[PDB]
Subunit: 248 residues, 4 copies
């Protein structure tokens, strides 16, 4: 009947805005304690406070810059002083540095790998303790349709979004004996506040790629993450769920 | 918070036992009116009555032999006299006729295609009316991990379970403009009452293919079908969700 | 450097189009070829043309994949002409394009019977020599739309996806006998049928339709020594 | 029938194993070959051996994929030896196998830096001639474990899956210039490293490990005229 996560603690990286924020709010709506992260601790704490006021949940904001190992490990010291541990991890944080391939600087490439892959690696390693101990955990990695299709100007980003699938399937196999389930969600074209910057022409060209004829909302992505964190997904691990309105 | 299907009508083919029955009970548990089908009308009506008593839902049983077009169309005449129409269709019904390839009779092959593919085609065609009219519908096709991996002795069955993926992706594109979402669920190794017939040795050999180290329950499959019928899956169409404990 | 002299290849539906290109490609590598079509006279004429062009042993047989009887008769003839088949290319296929809501049972069932059941029966009849000698290649022609789906093609896409399950399963069964089973999935290919139609082309990064010979070349690769460790695979 | 005379192929990490087999295969088809290894002396020795065996123009260069400086120096040398590169085989790769819960940041970061970032930089440096002439082949060596995942290999599997995104994206960007970008995903292959290990073999329908030459043959196909309509594809 209902999906309840009262008593669970969910960490959602890069959740001060956009899809990450929608994911944190969705988990909060189900009763989860939530941990909000951003490159600004002030903004993360502000967002946590707004979520706590809206849904009445225990919420904590931490500064976490996924470019920095020191920032990540320091964030976890603050986290483990506030909660017993983490039951649910959503590896949402990610960046793009879009350039045509020959025009892509080494820094453009390495930053995208550092955040999207190495950041995910470090955050996941940091989050497993309570999950392994109690033989229950959910890790949800946010991929992208472009990890599957490829995309012009995003060889770096697409490499990471595809790489997260290998990450997901391998980690799922390793953690399966401990009942810690590791899955991916691969959104298509999602409307966020940043969509407002696109021209009506190209925005229409994008919508034309989508059988449903509309962009998805951040909440529609968040709904699938919630499913994966719920008792409805107890036999799903090593899987990617595409959420793209029929594009792929 | 909750998944409610009160006011919806779900048809689940081949739902007098096993996974099909678990799917019908799960939808019933969420408040859906359910239609139960089997090759025996008496058994289908008996199962419907048991489900109605357990969950308190409106339930109807119809005889439907998916080997027969006449049986299917006749079943729908009874259905449309009992309900306004169908909002949710789960194409669960399927058969195997396992033979090594050179040893497979034409009837072994054609029966499997007739039920698994043509039966699905006919049931789906029969069920769309209300969905298209109201611009809301969910069709869930039950595939199998073997549609993806292949399996010795099941060239016929695997052909159909793979074919259902093409069916799903094509139909999803056609119906997307009407907001009728078409998806597949691909179970792995699921424990049913028929599992009791296997030797402990081979049953163990199967479990060894599964990272979670256990067979899934019919209810765990039913849970994923429910997700696809719920408001949590509003941006998912043309997708297959694997439910196999990490096998694939 | 790819030579198939001494091999016998059966290519179904090879009187025209991609099928003809595959048969000519195999012939160009030295294979004996068996051409099939719904018209035995046409199949024989095409075989004669290929034999004249490439200098190979070529035979034409009538084979209508809708009919078990047609298939049986064709194989009786085949096995009176060759010792057996080393290479099978399941190319024969049909479309009956209709929006799902306008699709008849016949629109559906004919496409399955030819594309799946015809393939099944042809394949069953083609394995004897391959299993005995522990060498054989079966190549199933699928389609990109089996993977992506396509509007107006729920029936065809079902069959082309189904052929993937068929390929993977059969590959597993035959692998102990070193009989390799693979699929080729062409995108948009310029054939005789294309002339009766820029748009579809906009979906293609290469910005052009493929030629039948380009598909044929991939079939040739799969029949070659270069593909000795590939089985249960789809080449797009 | 596959000839690469006049073509120049760069094969990274080709002093031994699958890399060496690929370089020898290309050489056997007539390609000029560039051999790389972390040891320039070893790379040069292997190039000399290949040149002696096949009669081709072969060059060995030191290239350590961890170091941008090493890569730059190697390409400076390369472009003083050849007009440019027509074929690139991104073969170089490392494993640092550890259970995830025992994996160090270095176990992780080294594997990404070599397998992904090294591939990135090598590829950027190899495109000039291909784009100019509107012909080129880039073949990325992935692995079955990129698709299935593997216990003890979360780092390696991440890179091998990532190379698929890399392949598909780069293929889309380069397709207008007719530069084709594909991946080969080997299963379990018997190499020099195998001897230090029936089980893994039980997962293989063919019931045997593949040879390095069998992988090399598929790379050769992708570099050939037979693969002219294949781009953004993985061959397993």
């Amino acid at each position: 009947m209902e999906i309840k996560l009262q008593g669970k603690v969910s960490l959602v990286t890069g959740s001060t805005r956009g899809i990450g924020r929608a994911i944190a709010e969705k988990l909060a709506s189900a009763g989860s304690t939530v941990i909000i992260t951003g490159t600004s601790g002030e903004r993360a704490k502000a967002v946590a406070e707004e979520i706590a006021n809206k849904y009445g949940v225990k919420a904590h904001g931490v500064e976490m810059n996924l470019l920095s190992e020191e920032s990540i490990n320091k964030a976890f010291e603050e986290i483990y002083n506030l909660v017993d541990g983490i039951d649910i991890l959503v590896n949402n944080a990610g960046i793009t540095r879009d350039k045509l391939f020959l025009r892509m600087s080494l820094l453009d490439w390495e930053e995208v790998l550092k955040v999207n892959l190495t950041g995910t690696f470090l955050v996941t390693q940091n989050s497993l303790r309570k999950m392994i101990k109690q033989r229950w955990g959910r890790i949800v990695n946010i991929s992208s349709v472009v990890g599957f299709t490829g995309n012009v100007g995003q060889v770096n980003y697409s490499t990471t979004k595809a790489g997260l699938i290998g990450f997901t399937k391998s980690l799922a196999k390793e953690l399966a004996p401990r009942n810690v389930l590791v899955n991916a969600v691969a959104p298509g074209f999602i409307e966020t506040d940043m969509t407002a910057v696109l021209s009506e022409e190209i925005k229409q060209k994008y919508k034309e790629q989508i059988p449903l004829g509309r962009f998805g909302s951040p909440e529609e992505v968040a709904n699938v993450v919630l499913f994966l964190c719920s008792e409805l997904a107890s036999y799903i691990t090593g899987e990617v769920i595409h959420v793209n309105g029929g594009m792929f």
